[PDB]
Design an enzyme around this catalytic site. Structure first.
Site, short mmCIF file in Angstrom:
data_model
loop_
_atom_site.label_atom_id
_atom_site.label_comp_id
_atom_site.label_asym_id
_atom_site.label_seq_id
_atom_site.Cartn_x
_atom_site.Cartn_y
_atom_site.Cartn_z
N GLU A 268 20.03 29.10 12.58
CA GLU A 268 20.46 29.88 13.75
C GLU A 268 19.89 29.58 15.08
O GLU A 268 19.93 30.63 15.95
CB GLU A 268 20.23 31.78 13.64
CG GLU A 268 18.87 32.18 13.44
CD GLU A 268 18.45 32.46 12.16
OE1 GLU A 268 18.52 31.73 11.78
OE2 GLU A 268 17.45 33.95 12.38
N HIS A 292 27.24 32.92 8.26
CA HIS A 292 25.40 33.39 8.06
C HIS A 292 24.81 33.09 9.12
O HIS A 292 24.26 33.57 9.61
CB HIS A 292 24.78 33.27 6.89
CG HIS A 292 23.52 33.20 6.63
ND1 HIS A 292 22.85 34.33 5.80
CD2 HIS A 292 21.90 33.08 7.38
CE1 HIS A 292 21.94 35.50 6.15
NE2 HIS A 292 20.82 34.17 6.83
N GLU A 293 25.11 31.77 9.98
CA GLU A 293 24.45 31.19 10.94
C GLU A 293 25.25 31.82 12.01
O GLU A 293 25.05 32.95 12.81
CB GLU A 293 24.43 29.50 10.85
CG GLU A 293 23.48 29.32 9.70
CD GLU A 293 22.12 29.68 9.97
OE1 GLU A 293 21.72 30.30 10.52
OE2 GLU A 293 21.53 29.79 8.21
N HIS A 296 24.02 35.33 12.81
CA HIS A 296 23.12 35.69 13.40
C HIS A 296 22.86 35.55 15.04
O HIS A 296 21.76 36.18 15.33
CB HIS A 296 22.41 34.67 13.26
CG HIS A 296 20.80 34.90 12.14
ND1 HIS A 296 20.36 36.24 11.96
CD2 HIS A 296 21.06 34.25 10.47
CE1 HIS A 296 19.46 35.80 10.77
NE2 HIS A 296 19.96 34.59 10.23
N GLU A 315 18.00 39.63 8.33
CA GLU A 315 18.59 39.09 7.40
C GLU A 315 19.38 39.61 6.68
O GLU A 315 20.36 39.32 6.25
CB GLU A 315 17.70 38.42 6.25
CG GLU A 315 16.56 37.32 7.19
CD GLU A 315 17.70 36.17 7.62
OE1 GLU A 315 18.67 36.31 7.40
OE2 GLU A 315 16.83 35.78 8.85
N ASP A 372 5.76 31.74 5.41
CA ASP A 372 5.70 30.51 4.98
C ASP A 372 5.89 31.13 3.20
O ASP A 372 6.72 30.77 3.00
CB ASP A 372 5.64 29.52 5.03
CG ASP A 372 5.78 28.86 6.61
OD1 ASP A 372 7.17 29.63 7.02
OD2 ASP A 372 5.59 28.09 6.89
N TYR A 380 16.85 39.18 2.03
CA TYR A 380 17.98 38.60 2.22
C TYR A 380 18.87 40.31 1.29
O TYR A 380 19.94 40.61 1.71
CB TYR A 380 18.23 37.44 1.82
CG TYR A 380 18.16 35.99 2.44
CD1 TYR A 380 16.98 35.69 3.00
CD2 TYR A 380 19.11 35.63 3.80
CE1 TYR A 380 16.53 35.07 3.35
CE2 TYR A 380 17.98 34.61 3.93
CZ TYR A 380 16.90 34.38 4.27
OH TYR A 380 16.64 33.16 5.35
O1 RE2 Z 1 10.80 30.30 8.32
C1 RE2 Z 1 10.20 32.03 8.08
C2 RE2 Z 1 11.36 33.04 8.10
C3 RE2 Z 1 10.85 34.40 8.44
C4 RE2 Z 1 10.31 34.46 7.43
C5 RE2 Z 1 8.95 36.08 6.98
C6 RE2 Z 1 9.16 36.10 5.56
C7 RE2 Z 1 9.78 37.62 5.10
C8 RE2 Z 1 9.57 37.17 3.14
C9 RE2 Z 1 9.62 39.29 3.04
O2 RE2 Z 1 10.04 39.40 2.04
C10 RE2 Z 1 9.25 39.70 4.12
C11 RE2 Z 1 8.81 40.17 5.20
O3 RE2 Z 1 9.26 41.12 6.18
C12 RE2 Z 1 9.46 38.25 5.94
C13 RE2 Z 1 8.84 33.49 6.70
C14 RE2 Z 1 9.48 32.10 7.34
ZN ZN Z 2 19.40 34.39 8.04
#
Ligand code: RE2
Ligand code: ZN
Ligand code: YB
Length: 606
Positions: A268, A292-293, A296, A315, A372, A380
């Site tokens: 986004e 979705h984008e 954001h 998300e 990551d 989500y």
């Molecule tokens: O490119 C991206 C973007 C966002 C994240 C964060 C990933 C994450 C996963 C989750 O289960 C809980 C979180 O609080 C955060 C990691 C990589």
């Molecule tokens: Zn998103």
């Protein structure tokens, strides 16, 4: 405190503005230049501050026209190295200075993928793109690499003159480079304060075509026409989003369609959404990713998670808006179909991780966890499921969308935590706190596994998918002749996808059933990426050797992690394809996106 950042926190000092002047060197795979940070002290007698860096070469640091002292700490794994700058004069509270850092990136920046001309469509020019979320901006430039700080930015980027630069910002002119006539300088302005993970850059042989009053689609020439058609619903989605969220504040909404190694469905980036070319199904059927984008532009980019522990705020609310846009366009029964499919993805993740896994919590403590590695569907879909539950609890979608609009208004241009959100939820629904106290907050926000309550889903569009899946699952060999191409006659591409998702949840099926399904339905001919993904997973898990080359081909010819990861994982779990899967990864790994390379390597234990 942001435990993913090594930099001074917002309580100490805050970057207000970045002016970036840089040059893209394709020959060395480096960006070189200056990052001028306008920093406001939040403390009395401030004499030093610390920035995030990752594989950066610092040349010098200039303040008030003089070089100052700085030191790089020891690398702390995926966080990089802290950079302490000694200020030449102590600052009082709210005083602002400009720190100009001269730096160079490493060819191995985890923020960047550098593509050779052979890895592009046109085959004559190289290509560069960034992906800063979550904590890779520090691998491009020194910064407070935390979404708790929001800044505006301007940039001047020198690139070979036959190539085009774009950024997450309004285009602000182009001229020859006065230091090198083989080059062009593209200028950019982002007037809206943003978290630094929304800083984005692409450099490549890019063409554009207008598809709405405030939207160009950008790609290599060979993808433009296809992309213009695929994403033609974009303006109508922006209008709906504006109705639900309030004014679109970013000026332009352009789209960039990246080469196939782009690691996610979308990013986004403000003024310029990035998308995977795997959206190009030919029939606009994957446009929920555009919704979705677009969403954001309110949830994520205006109201932002203060740390990555509260990523679900970004998300969950986005998926909630996304499903609304698509419900408006295609009907409330479709919104419920997508919501229900989402609940199924959540079951899959909880099932895959384990019902007590820490990464199945809505809020996750990311100290010592590389974001990551944590990334999944959970934020989500567990986030969406909470909002959908709450929608139902509190009176319905019209009522809950009133709250979503008030929430975006309230927190625009800020960075918030889960407690901030919940507080406002109780303030907005002050007359319904008895109903709000019925929710099991501790379970929903902090407990692993499936949520304690499943919302109510209309099953209308889903039933035919379940029905066909069950016919196949319960079929014996003497039933296989009854299956026919006419089975799929009344099913949309979305339903064909859900049919495969349902069936994949019971995989393996017997090989003869899978062989029959290809015979009667010709799923091998389908180029819709979602459909083809689940079909090939079903084939490989059901031990169909014929599907091995198809699965290897999909896993490597594009690099969307959603597809590439579980394909490699499935191919590694099938003894017949295991060795080839590992060898294939090994051969492609050097030319993979750095983050995807890292995660596939872990998945395969290689
Ligand atoms: O490119 C991206 C973007 C966002 C994240 C964060 C990933 C994450 C996963 C989750 O289960 C809980 C979180 O609080 C955060 C990691 C990589
Ligand atoms: Zn998103
Ligand atoms: Yb039978």
């Amino acid at each position: 405190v942001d435990t993913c950042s090594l930099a001074s926190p917002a309580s100490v000092c805050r970057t207000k503005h970045l002016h970036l002047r840089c040059s893209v060197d394709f020959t060395r795979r480096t960006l070189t230049g200056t990052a001028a940070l306008t920093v406001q002290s939040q403390e009395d007698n401030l004499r030093s501050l610390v920035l995030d860096t990752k594989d950066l070469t610092i040349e010098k640091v200039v303040i008030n026209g003089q070089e100052v002292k700085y030191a790089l700490g020891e690398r702390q794994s995926y966080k990089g190295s802290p950079m302490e700058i000694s200020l030449p004069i102590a600052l009082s509270k709210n005083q602002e200075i400009v720190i100009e850092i001269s730096f160079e990136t490493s060819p191995k920046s985890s923020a960047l993928q550098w593509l050779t001309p052979e890895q592009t469509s046109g085959k004559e020019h190289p290509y560069l793109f960034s992906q800063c979320q979550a904590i890779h901006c520090r691998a491009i430039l020194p910064c407070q690499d935390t979404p708790s700080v929001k800044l505006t930015y301007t940039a001047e980027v020198s690139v070979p003159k036959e190539l085009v630069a774009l950024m997450s910002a309004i285009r602000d002119g182009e001229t020859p480079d006065p230091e090198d006539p083989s080059r062009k300088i593209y200028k950019f302005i982002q007037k809206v304060p943003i978290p630094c993970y929304l800083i984005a850059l692409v450099v490549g042989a890019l063409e554009s075509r207008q598809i709405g009053p405030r939207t160009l689609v950008w790609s290599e020439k060979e993808q433009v026409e296809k992309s213009a058609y695929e994403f033609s619903e974009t303006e109508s989605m922006l209008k709906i989003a504006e109705d639900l969220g309030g004014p679109y504040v970013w000026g332009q909404y352009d789209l960039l369609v990246l080469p196939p190694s782009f690691p996610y469905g979308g990013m986004e980036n403000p003024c310029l959404t990035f998308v995977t070319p795997t959206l190009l199904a030919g029939d606009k059927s994957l446009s929920n990713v555009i919704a979705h984008e677009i969403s954001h532009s309110w949830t994520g980019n205006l109201v932002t998670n203060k740390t990555w522990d509260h990523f679900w705020l970004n998300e969950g609310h986005t998926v909630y808006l996304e499903r609304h846009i698509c419900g408006r366009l295609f009907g409330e029964k479709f919104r419920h179909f997508n919501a229900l499919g989402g609940w199924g993805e959540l079951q899959n993740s909880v099932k895959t991780f384990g019902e007590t896994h820490p990464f199945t919590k809505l809020v996750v403590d990311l100290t010592d966890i590389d974001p990551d590695v944590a990334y999944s569907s959970v934020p989500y879909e567990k986030g969406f499921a909470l909002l959908f539950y709450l929608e139902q609890l509190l009176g319905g979608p019209e009522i809950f969308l009133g709250f979503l609009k008030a929430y975006v208004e309230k927190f625009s241009y800020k960075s918030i935590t889960t407690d901030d959100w919940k507080d406002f939820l109780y303030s907005y629904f002050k007359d319904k706190v008895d109903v709000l106290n019925q929710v099991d907050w501790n379970a929903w926000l902090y407990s692993p596994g499936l949520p304690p309550i499943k919302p109510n889903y209309d099953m209308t569009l889903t039933n035919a998918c379940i029905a066909l899946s069950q016919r196949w699952i319960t079929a014996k060999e003497d039933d296989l002749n009854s299956f026919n191409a006419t089975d799929l006659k009344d099913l949309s591409s979305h339903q064909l996808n859900e049919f495969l998702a349902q069936t994949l949840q019971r995989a393996p099926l017997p090989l003869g059933h899978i062989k029959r399904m290809q015979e009667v339905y010709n799923f091998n001919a389908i180029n819709n990426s979602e459909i083809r993904f689940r079909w090939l997973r079903l084939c490989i898990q059901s031990k169909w050797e014929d599907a091995i080359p198809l699965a290897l081909k999909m896993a490597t010819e594009q690099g969307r992690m959603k597809f590439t990861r579980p394909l490699f994982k499935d191919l590694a779990a099938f003894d017949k394809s295991h060795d080839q899967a590992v060898r294939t990864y090994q051969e492609h790994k050097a030319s993979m996106h750095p983050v995807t390379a890292m995660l596939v390597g872990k998945d395969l234990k290689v």
